[model samples]
Target: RARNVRSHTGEYAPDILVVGSCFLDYVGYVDHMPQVGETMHSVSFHKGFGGKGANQAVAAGRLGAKVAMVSMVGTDGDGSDYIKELERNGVDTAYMFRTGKSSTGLAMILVDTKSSNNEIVICPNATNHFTPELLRAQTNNYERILHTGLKYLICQNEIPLPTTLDTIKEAHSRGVYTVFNSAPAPKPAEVEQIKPFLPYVSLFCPNEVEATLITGVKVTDTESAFSAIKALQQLGVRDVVITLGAAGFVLSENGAEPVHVTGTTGAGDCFVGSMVYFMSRGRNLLEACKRANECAAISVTRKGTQL
Candidate 1:
């Protein structure tokens, strides 16, 4: 019998690196949702750190994965507070940028307790200030000075598309896996623009609505989901994962069978974070998705994003 051997890289490597928008979320939960032009009183009001990038980064960190954040915030007090919060959560914030002119990003979230549904509106502000030059400057010594290895780079479409494109290109050059969460919706033309970058993504995660908008395929059932995932895979994505919101999620990989899970709010983000974390440790995609499902279950049972 021959003994198996594996090469060792003696340095610590981060499980995931998140680059996108970070915002201060002002949340209100009400018994019933307000009708158009109707007023309603909130049962609860809370302020927390959130944004696709920030929330996912913290989720990964809490799950025991070493994570880093590369994003932008304002020079205002809100931004200052968020930075401290990220640091306290054990997230690496050295790559975060600050814009003096703009205020920190903000999201107004309304939750209907009865329905477990939410409506959110965001203002990017400083988050929109992230530029390619800034990203390069921040990540220039990413390989040398940090003495850390990065297995995955997770991003969202909340920020400027140009910035996302550039970041993806750079990550590809360095052989880092990429995950793109297209959320909050982009225009049809903008979606087309990002199609070319899909080939570089290791995983593409989107909700049912987003999946439909991006692929122009109506996701009515498992068959539709497969068609949508296949369309994306054909465009160069190695894997496609569509979140069905309480129906779970459906995923397809190159020449492999598709997998589906139940739906839950925030599960998509949690899945992205957890999948990247586990994959960095050499776990297969299916195992990673299971961990993500667990994390999301915890999130839905709780009141807010943090679990």
Candidate 2:
């Protein structure tokens, strides 16, 4: 089955190019929060490959999209491990660069037992060094990737802002579809940096909190979510999806109800990945959103960031 799938439709060139970050995640499941200066026991602990960009790339790759990643990692063990993880899931790693000065991105995620909610603190590390200059300097790589039937480009907020904005500009200029998953929402100072690139995005999908921050609408329910979408639309985005994890998602003209709740970590990335896969197969936006919603719900039921 696997061999047939890979050989039947896989091409030498990728259909989706994911520009993003890579992280070695350290996760701890705890019954409650730990106070400052206090040590507590975790019910469980696990370490794995994560980072919105890597997770989404892996997600699309797992579903058999000819996906390639453009990002950076530290020249260290964790960086090598993350590249291996991406390759194991069928993502092409030819453009994954490494820097000797920084470490691979690192995240400390703490998941609460009762709510299945997670809090994370990230040290962007080498991803911060993934600059627009580096992307532009890869003239040959971009020349090959941009002209080789690459249908969509997926980007996230984990990397440097200017780099992402420049990527959007570059890909949009060349007629490639751009999907921006504005996760790990930017702070106030960085919000304005995102506006100039909004017009170039083919699809903008952000979780409710991110949507709220971007649009200044308190996203308590569907009406507010739509308001947020409208604000984005006014800012020149053609399509938007405000993903309200567990509560469902609200789109410009459609909506999806939530599935049974479970682990919330990396669910958004799963949705983005699944949506890209279906869209690349020519599914309409509504159809793709519904399928991605289901895929994300299934992801939350499992442990860890990647499936």
Candidate 3:
């Protein structure tokens, strides 16, 4: 337990390395969606750490996974603030990079008072400056980290598309399980870049839109989602998790049924993070996914990027 560092959570070295983006979320809570060109008063406003990668890392840390984050933050103070936030949550940030002049990533969020859901407009800013070539140049450092008994490498499309694939390949080469979150639905060209590496990913989880973008199959129902998961599995991905927002998620194993849940901005992150914690305990994908749903269900009742 002493080696874990954050003994309050558990005794373990960082078993999960998260490679993704970091952002500051500026949010507004409103009673209803504003019409285009219409003005309305927000009930409240707040700012916090966000970015899919950061959120997932925090989620895993909070759920007792020894997690470390590898990403680029901008020169602005938001970068420092986010580091503090992640550290407070028990996520190691020693591998995070600080960009020279760019501002940290930002998400302009709008959530309704009636529901925990929200819409977002993101600006990659500093994250855009992070390149696959930079990571490639640092390959030796990354390889050393992989050799240290790391069990999982989780990533998303927030970084360079090629970089995500390259990381997947590297993790696979070392027998480390890789979890790919095909998030925010990549553009056509980005989709092309990721396709070839799907075979290397141990688990490829995407939301409805992401699945639709890659497989050209809209997951509108249980029957349709199964077909879509098969399409993705056929690409050599061993496992799949397809999120359906308030409708819960569909798994790619044994025709598992969706687990219904409520609404919240952090539900997805909660689920992803919970899976990391459960899977680290030697649970199978099916058991881990079920536990993840329960964890996410709690987050759905709360309101924020990190529960």
Query: Candidate 2: which stretches are off by over 4 Å?
Result: 1-11, 28-45, 109-121, 253-263, 304-307
lDDT (10s digit) by residue, model 2, range 168-277: 87888888989999877889877888887888988899887888888888987777877888888878887787787778777763223322222276888999999999
lDDT of 3 by residue, 87-168 (tens): 8888987667777778889989899858767888898888887776777565463653465578998998888777678888
lDDT of each: 0.77, 0.81, 0.79
| TM-scores of all candidate predictions against the true structure | 0.83, 0.83, 0.83
lDDT of 1 by residue, 1-307 (tens): 0111112562344557788889898899999878899888999998978888888887787767778787888878888888888877767776677879999999888988789899888888898778766666665734421333667888888888878777776676677788888876768887888888888888888877788888888987777888899888888888788877767778876638888765544556766787777777787777777778777788667745452
* CA deviation > 4 Å runs, candidate 3: 1-13, 28-43, 110-120, 139-141, 253-263, 304-307
What's the best-to-worst order under lDDT? Answer: 2, 3, 1
